[PDB]
Structures are given as structure tokens and as C-alpha cells.
Design a protein around this ligand. Structure first.
Ligand SMILES: NCCc1cccc(NC(=O)c2cc(Cl)cc(NC(=O)OCc3ccccc3)c2)c1
Lengths: 156, 39
């Protein structure tokens, strides 16, 4: 199948027509997405198959064909870009200054941008174009607004 | 059965639309990967 680096849609034909369930990143021959998008199931890419390699429900992340490769981190000061890939719509970069998720185990960057659930797995990038995490696991705040964590995996 | 379709390159876009705010929120993360607001 196509293994060129880039952002990809994750589609399914189980439901009505072809539905976009999420998004992912292809980098160094490994496909990276959120666990809740595929539930760790195998994926098709043309006539080829992608098999899960690593996953973790608590991190809400999964990698296919190899170990998690993305290791860039938000610097805590600079604006970032969500490369949003919404269902049925063109890939579009949206710039924003991330907020903070304060937890008992440390602080995590957060992006306050509102997209359909099928946008889950869209990469958040730094000014160098490096993927600092994936969009789609977060919380619904008081005013019904959605705030996603900047979810990044560990590179062994 | 699920499949992937290329949507584009991963690049920074100069002069992209700038929006969203930067909230500081106290949160908890459970074993199921669900974030919740702490109050
Ligand atoms: N917690 C384990 C992981 C998990 C499991 C299952 C799902 C998720 N993620 C999400 O539900 C999710 C993802 C994104 Cl990209 C956006 C949104 N929210 C949003 O923008 O919603 C807009 C809206 C419009 C009309 C009515 C209601 C909502 C949610 C994580």
C-alpha cells in the first residue's frame, strides 16, 4: 500500500456509505492514530494490510507496522497548528496558542478547537512541521466547548 | 473493515487562520483514558 509520509483519513464501510472515523500520521513506515479511532483493529491501505504493533487505552494511542516514532514536544510557550482533517472536508491548518491540562502526574498542553469527532487523530505541529501530538482526547468544558489534550507517545 | 486514504503533507502553513483560546484546567485521567475536570 501507500506508505509515503503524510496525514491520512481513517475510513470504514461498515456503516452507511463510507464514514470517516478518524485520522492518522504516517512517519518512518509506521502509522500512528488514537486508540478510540480503530480500537486496535487491522487497517487496509490499498491492497496491503497494516497490523497493530503497539497500543495503550490509557494514553489513547496505537501504532501500526512498528513502534511509536513521534517524539517532538510542545515548548510550553509557542503557538502551534492543528492540521485538521475533518470528515468530507479538505485538510486545513489552524493556528492556536495551547492552554494547559494540570494533572497530579504533570502538565500537558491542550488545544481549544472544535471539530467533529471523526477529526480524532489529526496531528498538532510545531513551527518546524514536527508532530507534537494528536488531537481528539480531552474534555467538554462548562460552555459546551471541547478542549483536547496534545497527546504524544513515547519513542523507545 | 477499515482503510486509510492520504489527505495531505504535514507542513506548517505561514499565515494560517489563527483562533482558539488557552485555558488552564485542573484535570484527572482515569484507567479508561477519559479526562475529567477536577472541582
Ligand atoms: N476517552 C477515551 C478516548 C475517546 C473515546 C471516544 C471519543 C473520544 N473523542 C471524542 O468524543 C471527541 C473528539 C473530537 Cl476530535 C471532538 C469532540 N468534540 C467535539 O468537538 O464535539 C462537537 C459536538 C457537536 C455537536 C454535538 C456534540 C459535540 C469529541 C475520545
Amino acid at each position: 500500500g501507500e506508505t509515503t509520509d503524510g496525514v491520512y483519513r481513517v475510513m470504514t464501510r461498515r456503516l452507511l456509505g463510507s464514514t470517516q472515523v478518524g485520522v492518522g500520521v504516517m512517519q518512518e513506515g509506521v502509522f500512528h492514530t488514537m486508540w478510540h479511532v480503530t480500537k486496535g483493529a487491522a487497517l487496509r491501505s490499498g491492497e496491503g494490510r497494516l497490523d497493530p504493533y503497539w497500543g495503550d487505552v490509557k494514553q489513547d494511542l496505537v501504532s501500526y507496522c512498528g513502534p511509536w516514532k513521534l517524539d517532538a514536544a510542545w515548548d510550553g510557550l509557542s503557538e502551534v497548528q492543528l492540521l485538521a482533517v475533518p470528515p468530507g472536508e479538505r485538510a486545513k491548518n489552524i493556528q492556536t496558542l495551547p492552554g494547559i491540562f494540570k494533572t497530579k502526574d504533570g502538565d500537558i498542553g491542550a488545544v481549544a478547537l472544535d471539530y467533529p469527532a471523526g477529526t480524532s487523530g489529526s496531528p498538532i505541529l510545531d513551527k518546524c512541521g514536527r508532530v507534537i501530538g494528536l488531537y481528539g482526547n480531552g474534555v467538554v468544558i462548562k460552555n459546551g466547548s471541547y478542549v483536547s489534550a496534545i497527546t504524544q507517545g513515547k519513542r523507545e | 473493515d477499515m482503510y486509510i486514504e492520504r489527505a495531505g503533507d504535514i507542513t506548517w502553513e505561514k499565515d494560517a487562520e489563527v483562533t482558539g483560546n488557552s485555558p488552564r484546567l485542573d484535570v484527572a485521567l482515569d484507567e479508561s483514558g477519559d479526562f475529567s475536570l477536577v472541582e
